[PDB]
Design a protein around this ligand. Structure first.
Ligand SMILES: [Mg+2]
Ligand SMILES: [Zn+2]
Ligand SMILES: [Zn+2]
Ligand SMILES: [Zn+2]
Length: 601
């Protein structure tokens, strides 16, 4: 158990100063902030904790204000004394999710520098799939130590305390332990992170430098027009009511729009083959086949999609506007995916329909403030370009080199015809093949997406490999080393460990083989995107132009740029993204602008 004896609670300047002096001479030191809220832009700093050595840590409370709280160094005095050390790039700091701490300090005009080690990221790079990368999971895995949980000192549910209400010593145990454990975790993981120059490279030049840029993107937020979202909601209520009527009218009587309950009884009872359509889904969607002739499955399909969208973005988004900035601040997660891509929540920007009109209308609500425009910089089919490079295929490489549509270029080789004549159906077939290779899909899987018979899909796949021999060879070589070393790598050295690569279980080992082929392309896209963000952010920080980097979704970066600066800025973002990342993969950035994200997109 952690008691009051482990860590000191600093309540006087003299003692703070003695610690600042010891911290100034330490090789590295763990740093942590405690606040009254998870909301970064509006959280107030309640205290800070440091650890100079395993077992030697302190908690400096500055804003506890429960009834009769003892005197504390004031927040303003603690920060002015600590400011030099925090802003010194030479004073190296260790922390768990330093993105959060860097932001809190920024609420006071302090720029945390020397952001050298983040234990969450040390863990993530060592093995993205070892388990959760939070401090409690980390402490238990690497230190065989169970940490004090927030719920343990603050309580649970609606009656949970905020940090400023927690007694000094209790807050101390929690805060000082965070700092202590964090430093111990670093001492155990940092040495390990050196056994391989690959992960070390990614951790050092991709992950760590991205910490403060994600903080800045999150705190910048994105301007959302709540009126637009509201009208969209009202209109969707009318449209859903109308569709319900259109459905009732195509059949007889009233009924819910739920399959395997009410639909099979109408749809198949009035002709159609018995199997219902599961919402599995993107492999055999019964309702959408019927859609090409049968009107009911079409209106039930268009209905559900609209209902899901309205409650997920139309009704939720306006509620996410922060009263302090008037903007929405999404949460980017740097250590969650297996491949290295950034994930996103509240809102999950990646789930906003891309090829659909309603998704387009959601995007129309992401607007630019007055005298600014939304600028969208996208990496055109980066994953496919990466595959071209990874497979050393002169065919694909040349298609990209001469600016041809790779899907039509691919179709012209797989079907053997001039590029000008390739039909829409041939392009759609080559496209399914191409993007099917990225996710390592089976000839049968391809057939399930192309609506053709098995072995016909196999026919398209055999013709592809004959024409693009380099891709089969990459695919075979990748599944090979995956079984040899138990993991696959990206161009920068990032690793995806594959434990089920020899699973024996057919399904699991199947998944592990698809992950083997996919991770190097997806992880490499992720690495390039992070390097671009770091590069664009560095220019932003050095030059201070009239631009804010507001989002990262899929392979695009979204900005707010001043209307009178769009041309120069666009030229700049463009050169940075395709010329300041990897020089080996043939990259292309499509830059676009408009009054809203939909227009720029
Ligand atoms: Mg913390
Ligand atoms: Zn803490
Ligand atoms: Zn992509
Ligand atoms: Zn260019």
């Amino acid at each position: 158990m952690i008691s009051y004896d482990n860590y000191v609670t600093i309540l006087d300047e003299e003692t703070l100063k003695a610690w600042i002096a010891k911290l100034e001479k330490a090789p590295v030191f763990a740093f942590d902030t405690e606040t009254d809220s998870l909301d970064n832009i509006s959280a107030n700093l309640v205290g800070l904790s440091f650890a100079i050595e395993p077992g030697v840590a302190a908690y400096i409370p500055v804003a506890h204000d429960y009834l009769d709280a003892p005197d504390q160094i004031s927040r303003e005095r603690a920060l002015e004394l600590l400011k030099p050390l925090l802003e010194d790039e030479k004073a190296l700091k260790v922390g768990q999710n330093l993105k959060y701490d860097r932001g809190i300090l920024a609420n006071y005009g302090i720029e945390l520098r020397g952001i050298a080690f983040d234990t969450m990221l040390e863990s993530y790079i060592l093995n993205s799939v070892a388990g959760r990368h939070d401090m409690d999971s980390l402490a238990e895995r690497w230190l065989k130590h169970k940490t004090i949980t927030f719920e343990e000192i603050a309580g649970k549910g609606k009656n949970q305390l905020t940090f400023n209400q927690i007694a000094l010593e209790e807050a101390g145990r929690y805060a000082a332990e965070d700092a202590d454990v964090t430093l111990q975790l670093h001492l155990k993981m940092w040495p390990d992170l050196q056994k391989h120059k690959g992960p070390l490279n990614v951790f050092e030049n991709i992950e760590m430098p991205l910490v403060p840029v994600l903080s800045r993107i999150e705190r910048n937020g994105v301007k959302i027009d709540p009126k637009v979202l509201h009208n969209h909601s009202e209109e969707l209520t009318l449209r859903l009511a109308e569709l319900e009527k259109k459905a009732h009218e195509i059949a007889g009587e009233e009924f819910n729009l739920s399959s395997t309950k009410q639909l099979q009884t109408i749809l198949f009872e009035k002709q159609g083959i018995k199997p219902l359509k599961k919402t599995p889904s993107t492999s055999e969607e019964v309702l959408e086949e019927l859609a090409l002739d049968y009107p009911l499955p079409k209106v039930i399909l268009e209905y559900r999609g609209l209902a899901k969208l309205k409650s997920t973005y139309t009704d939720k988004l306006p509620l996410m506007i922060n009263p302090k900035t008037g903007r929405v601040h999404t949460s980017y997660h740097q250590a969650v995916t297996a491949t290295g891509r950034l994930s996103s929540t509240d809102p999950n920007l990646q789930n906003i329909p891309v090829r659909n009109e309603e998704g387009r209308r959601i995007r129309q609500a992401f607007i630019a403030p007055e005298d600014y425009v939304i600028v969208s910089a996208d990496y055109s089919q980066i994953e496919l370009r990466i595959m071209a490079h990874l497979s050393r295929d002169k065919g694909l490489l040349t298609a990209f080199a001469e600016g041809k549509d790779i899907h039509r270029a691919t179709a012209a080789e797989v079907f053997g015809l001039p590029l000008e004549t390739v039909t829409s159906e041939q392009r759609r077939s080559a496209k399914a093949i191409n993007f099917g290779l990225i996710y390592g899909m089976s000839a049968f899987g391809l057939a399930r997406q192309l609506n053709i018979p098995r072995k016909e899909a196999q026919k398209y796949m055999d013709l592809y490999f004959e024409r693009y021999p380099g891709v089969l060879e990459y695919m075979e070589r990748t599944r090979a080393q995956a079984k040899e070393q138990g993991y696959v790598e990206t161009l920068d050295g990032r690793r995806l460990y594959l434990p089920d690569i020899k699973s024996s279980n057919g399904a699991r080992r199947a998944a592990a083989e698809r992950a083997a082929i996919n991770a190097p392309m997806q992880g490499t896209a992720a690495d390039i995107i992070k390097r671009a963000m770091i590069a664009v952010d560095a220019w932003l920080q050095a030059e201070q132009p009239r631009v804010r980097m507001i989002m990262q979704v899929h392979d695009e970066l979204v900005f707010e740029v001043h209307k009178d600066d769009v041309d120069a800025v666009a030229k700049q973002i463009h050169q940075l993204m395709e010329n300041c990342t990897r020089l080996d993969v043939p990259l292309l950035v499509e830059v676009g602008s408009g009054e809203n994200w939909d227009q720029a997109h």
